[PDB]
Design a protein around this ligand. Structure first.
Ligand SMILES: Nc1ncnc2c1ncn2[C@@H]1O[C@H](COP(=O)(O)OP(=O)(O)O)[C@@H](O)[C@H]1O
Ligand SMILES: Nc1ncnc2c1ncn2[C@@H]1O[C@H](COP(=O)(O)OP(=O)(O)O)[C@@H](O)[C@H]1O
Lengths: 240, 240
């Protein structure tokens, strides 16, 4: 005989492992380009030491730095991936004005949004600044995933594609809503979209977004209607 | 009811996954030190550009290079790990003199061997050079794991601890034996030691060693007696 739940789990684990394997394989390769550009603009330099003008320096130095910043972002994706695996991701909270955090995020996503003819808005039902004891870097990361998704899953047939961040306070905490009039999400998938790798049909997406919110002691969920759009809710403690 | 083999597999897969997770976590962290030293000896430099003598250069450049070479070795361990996972590791064969390859390997392990009072020997039952169409870098890696193991598992109570590489030709191919008079290996573990992570009780050990040999079309196995020592055999096609 057999245990069907067990078999489904085993099969589920093997398919997830294939995906983790492909993730690790891809990031391994991407880490190569930078480590290449870094070395190049260096072992070459050292060896031609006795024959170099220092012009072949300020521009070149900028290269190692741009490349290094690229390798750093990649190592961070790998480290985020590892930390999410081990549930060891941490947050470092401080007093932050959520209004500024949101405007900045909206700013960073403006180019991509325009690229798809999607307008990004921000509304606060409470006077700014809206101070919260949170990890600014992490919640910016939260928000950006949310915003990027609002653009990516916008509804082609809508003349007014948009993604709007609504800020507010509730139940003693802060409620952030990222609303879009996109394609929406089917009922069977409203919890599953938060699982690593899941897609209704690198980055860590909604899975790290959920972990960041939960680490703050909050909750995230979605309310959506296919063809109409989705509202992702993020409730976090405000006070601390 | 249930399928016992299935349950054992599931449990086996989860424990292996914990180990892969810890491997990825550790290499992620180690990659940090170099990327740190690299940037440091750089973003600092660029910013103090208008005030720097070029002495704060040749020694410093050496730092970025030593560090880069360290990051490169680490990225290679991660990439080897990934390739072993996907069975996508490749070899690039060429005409190689196995005698020189072995002497070089023995040379590289001499310090560590001395550290444990283990003598390393090399014998060839055929006149050198012993030419084989193989991947030099990979077979050096094979051999070094083998040699390192011979030192690591040497028998404390032996006055003449040693590890000897014996070169020879057989069945139309080349037979390499790495013999030690170490602690030996129990019967139940003679195939299992080649599995990733297995220990009778970073690097990839015997698992990548086996993959490298098999990619050459060869075979590896061990013959051992607890308390007496082990002989690891590597038979590979010679001709190609
Ligand atoms: N605003 C949204 N509208 C519709 N579907 C969404 C939205 N945000 C997320 N999803 C669903 O959740 C899945 C996972 O999202 P995410 O983790 O960000 O990865 P992808 O966005 O798939 O890398 C998406 O593939 C999609 O099916
Ligand atoms: N020469 C040897 N003598 C005794 N045991 C050995 C030898 N080589 C390998 N082994 C066994 O195989 C296991 C796996 O070896 P390896 O993959 O090199 O990892 P460790 O060497 O465990 O990182 C060892 O933990 C040990 O139990």
């Amino acid at each position: 005989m057999e245990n069907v739940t067990e078999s489904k789990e085993l099969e589920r684990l093997k398919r997830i492992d294939r995906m983790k394997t492909e993730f690790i394989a891809n990031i391994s390769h991407e880490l190569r380009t930078p480590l290449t550009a870094i070395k190049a603009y260096a072992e070459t330099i050292y060896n031609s030491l006795g024959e170099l003008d220092l012009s072949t320096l300020k521009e070149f130095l900028e290269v190692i730095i741009d490349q290094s910043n690229h390798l750093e972002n990649l190592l961070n994706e790998l480290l985020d991936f590892s930390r999410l695996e081990r549930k060891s991701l941490q947050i470092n909270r401080e007093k932050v004005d959520l209004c500024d955090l949101v405007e900045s995020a909206v700013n960073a996503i403006k180019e991509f949004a325009s690229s798809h003819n999607v307008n990004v808005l921000f509304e606060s039902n409470v006077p700014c600044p809206v101070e919260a004891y949170i990890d600014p870097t992490r919640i910016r990361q939260v928000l950006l995933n949310l915003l990027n998704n609002g653009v990516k899953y916008s509804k082609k047939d809508a003349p007014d594609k948009y993604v709007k961040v609504i800020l507010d306070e509730k139940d003693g905490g802060v409620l952030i809503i990222v609303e879009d009039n996109g394609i929406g999400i089917p009922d069977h998938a409203k919890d599953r979209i938060f699982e690593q790798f899941y897609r209704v049909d690198t980055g860590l997406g909604l899975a790290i977004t959920k972990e960041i919110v939960e680490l703050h002691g909050g909750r995230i969920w979605v309310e959506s209607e296919v063809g109409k759009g989705s509202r992702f809710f993020v409730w976090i403690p405000k006070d601390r």
